[PDB]
Design an enzyme around this catalytic site. Structure first.
Site, mmCIF file in Angstrom:
data_model
loop_
_atom_site.group_PDB
_atom_site.id
_atom_site.type_symbol
_atom_site.label_atom_id
_atom_site.label_comp_id
_atom_site.label_asym_id
_atom_site.label_seq_id
_atom_site.Cartn_x
_atom_site.Cartn_y
_atom_site.Cartn_z
ATOM 1 N N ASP A 15 13.456 5.086 32.672
ATOM 2 C CA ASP A 15 14.271 4.207 31.831
ATOM 3 C C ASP A 15 14.551 2.858 32.493
ATOM 4 O OD1 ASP A 15 17.525 5.962 32.212
ATOM 5 O OD2 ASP A 15 16.291 4.961 33.707
ATOM 6 N N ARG A 29 17.098 -2.060 31.964
ATOM 7 C CA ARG A 29 17.491 -0.693 31.683
ATOM 8 C C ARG A 29 17.266 -0.455 30.190
ATOM 9 N NH1 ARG A 29 18.997 3.763 30.185
ATOM 10 N NH2 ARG A 29 20.347 5.209 31.339
ATOM 11 N N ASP A 34 19.012 8.105 27.973
ATOM 12 C CA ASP A 34 19.048 8.678 29.303
ATOM 13 C C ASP A 34 17.806 9.515 29.577
ATOM 14 O OD1 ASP A 34 21.576 7.768 30.214
ATOM 15 O OD2 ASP A 34 22.616 9.469 29.281
ATOM 16 N N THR A 35 16.985 9.170 30.556
ATOM 17 C CA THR A 35 15.870 10.052 30.894
ATOM 18 C C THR A 35 16.187 10.814 32.171
ATOM 19 O OG1 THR A 35 14.898 8.340 32.197
ATOM 20 C CG2 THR A 35 14.166 8.467 29.923
ATOM 21 N N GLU A 37 16.104 11.788 35.951
ATOM 22 C CA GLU A 37 15.884 10.872 37.056
ATOM 23 C C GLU A 37 14.967 11.489 38.113
ATOM 24 O OE1 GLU A 37 20.142 8.859 36.176
ATOM 25 O OE2 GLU A 37 18.692 8.074 37.611
ATOM 26 N N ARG A 81 21.318 -5.599 35.447
ATOM 27 C CA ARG A 81 20.131 -5.221 34.666
ATOM 28 C C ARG A 81 20.211 -5.674 33.218
ATOM 29 N NH1 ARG A 81 20.007 1.009 35.914
ATOM 30 N NH2 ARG A 81 22.124 0.772 35.061
#
Length: 135
Positions: A15, A29, A34-35, A37, A81
């Site tokens: 992500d 971002r 949410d992927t 990690e 970001r």
């Protein structure tokens, strides 16, 4: 909302991407997702983390064109970001990840929630199909 061009510099995680935008190198971002990690000593390589990262990487590396689309709210987070929807050859990377069960829809912060219902629909479908994290 409008799309603007960017050039890939480096895919970092499922992500997070490093792009050249308006002539400056910038970390982006992916908004609303949410992927799992790969990063963090405080977690480790979570499950499907590597898969999500390879998916994002191949999709952006193999594209003819990449575009970034800011939402209506703040455009950077506290880490500097950029916060955006990213498109590879006209396909939204954020949606693709969710549609494959490689990402969850994130906690959402109005007003940065324009594609929220679109993504939640792809998420209910990947759930329905029991894909990857919903396996």
């Amino acid at each position: 909302l409008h799309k603007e061009p960017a050039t890939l510099i480096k895919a970092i995680d499922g992500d997070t991407l490093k792009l050249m935008y308006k002539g400056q190198p910038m970390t982006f971002r992916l908004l609303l997702v949410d992927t799992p990690e790969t990063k963090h000593p405080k977690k480790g390589v979570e499950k499907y983390g590597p898969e999500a990262s390879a998916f994002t990487k191949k999709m952006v590396e193999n594209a003819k064109k990449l575009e970034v689309e800011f939402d209506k709210g703040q455009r950077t987070d506290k880490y500097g970001r950029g916060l955006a929807y990213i498109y590879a050859d006209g396909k939204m990377v954020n949606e693709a990840l969710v549609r494959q069960g490689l990402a969850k829809v994130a906690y959402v912060y109005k007003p940065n929630n324009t594609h929220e219902q679109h993504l939640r629909k792809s998420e209910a479908q990947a759930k329905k199909e029991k894909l990857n994290i919903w396996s």
